[PDB]
Design a protein around this nucleic acid. Sequence first.
DNA 1: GCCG
DNA 2: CAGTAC
DNA 3: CGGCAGTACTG
Length: 320
Amino acid sequence: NHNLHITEKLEVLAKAYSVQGDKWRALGYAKAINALKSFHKPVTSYQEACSIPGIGKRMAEKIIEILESGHLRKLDHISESVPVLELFSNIWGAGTKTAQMWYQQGFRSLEDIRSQASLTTQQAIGLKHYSDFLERMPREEATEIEQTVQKAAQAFNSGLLCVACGSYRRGKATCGDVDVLITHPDGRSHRGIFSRLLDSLRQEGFLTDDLVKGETKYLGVCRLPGPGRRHRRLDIKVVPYSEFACALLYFTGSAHFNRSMRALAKTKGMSLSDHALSTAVVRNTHGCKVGPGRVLPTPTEKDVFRLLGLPYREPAERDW
DNA sequence: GCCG
DNA sequence: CAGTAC
DNA sequence: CGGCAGTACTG
Ligand SMILES: Cc1cn([C@H]2C[C@H](O)[C@@H](COP(=O)(O)O)O2)c(=O)[nH]c1=O
Ligand SMILES: [Ca+2]
Ligand SMILES: [K+]
Ligand SMILES: [K+]
Ligand code: NA
Ligand code: NA
């Protein structure tokens, strides 16, 4: 909380490495930023920095250069392309490779992209909602969106469970988007639901754009009725009842939380996914899986933590 | 970038 | 497959 | 040295 003197400047570098494609270096920065964001005291000494898991020599040296100087020299040598690459990769469906290609082609503005760029179907939808998708909504709107999906789903089968996950479920005041997880306790009635449900939501004009339409994941765009409404990203994921706890866990996040849980499971010979916690997973020397293992029974999220030797954590306690 |  | 996002 | 989470979709 109190190290913003440092994190604020480190975040500029992390983002700069991210948009330029240097994904693992940006992962290092992102981790050290989360570490700093959860210490107890403001870091004041080189040796006090290296004590924190995720902060090494190079990162500690920058941490001191900020206290001795208030500024970090690296920030003055960030490529002039970075603001433009960030602009381009804030389009949904465009990442670092697409942004770098557009930059190499001489594009510098969203007007350039609009008029001259080659765009996928997803990216054109991303661009059309560029401003709207950079906004977080108040959680009260997220409730309305979840309620709209629930009511349409439960109209086909009142046995369907519907749970909004993500930052909503972690109790945040604003939500970048809404993910509604859908299952059925009977273990089979969840099947074949999309075609009807999405049609129901489509007929009223609530769904405005589809980005992904898979057998289990729908990603798209919605807008509530009336004036004053913005387009929002909506996900609907339909899973079998036995995978519900692992799905709830993944889709609730946070992303850094999921990755640290999965990294932990790997060290214990296990494998954790949005489908299941698996055991006796056989892997090779590069950490790649070769043998699948056995699915462990996880009727609730508490079981996942227990099977991993961890104290449970409420959704609100999973920011990192 | 960090860490085993 | 590579790219992207969940 | 070398992995850093695991998977679903798209074209
Ligand atoms: C962005 C992101 C999300 N997630 C998970 C955690 C998020 O709560 C969940 C839904 O993503 P979203 O909130 O961006 O729709 O997906 C990852 O596992 N990895 C990622 O890189
Ligand atoms: Ca979220
Ligand atoms: K450390
Ligand atoms: K265009
Ligand atoms: Na993007
Ligand atoms: Na979403």
